[PDB]
Structure 1
Amino acid sequence: QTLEHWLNVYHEGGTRLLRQMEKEAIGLWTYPNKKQYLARLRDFFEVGEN
């Protein structure tokens, strides 16, 4: 997965397509809000926001 990959799919179709592919995909997680994304990250790095 790459920025280019996601931009390509974005031009291919809307975020609907993005998340449909993400369902189809692995090692990936979308986050239509930032806080959830940030929780995911702080999870994956054993570190608080501070």
Structure 2
Amino acid sequence: QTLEHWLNVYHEGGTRLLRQMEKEAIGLWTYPNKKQYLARLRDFFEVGEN
């Protein structure tokens, strides 16, 4: 999964396409707002938000 891949996918279609790709592809995650993504970063790197 790469940034160019994401840009090409987006050029094909909007958010819904990326959400479908999320189901299709393994080892990938997306979040429509920054809070859940930051929670994912926290639980991945095992560090308090500060």
- Asked if TM exceeds 0.5, the reply is yes
- Aligned-residue identity in percent: 100
Q: In the comparison of the two structures, how many residue pairs are matched?
A: 50
- How much has 1:11 moved relative to structure 2? 0.3
Comparing both chains, which one has the higher relative contact order based on Cα–Cα distances under 8 Å and sequence gaps of 6 or more? 1
Unaligned runs of 5+ in 1: none
Shift of 1:4: 0.8
Partner of 1:38: 38
Which 4+ runs in 1 deviate beyond 4 A? none
Any stretches of 5+ residues in structure 2 without a counterpart? none
Partner Cα distance (1:43, 1:11) in 2: 31
User: What is the alpha-carbon distance in structure 2 between the residues aligned to residue 3 and residue 48 of structure 1?
Assistant: 28
Written as runs of structure 1 = structure 2, the 5 A alignment for 1:11-26 is 11-26=11-26
1:19 Cα deviation (Å)?
Answer: 0.6
* Displacement after TM superposition at 1:40 (Å): 0.5
Following superposition, the deviation at residue 8 of structure 1 comes to: 0.6
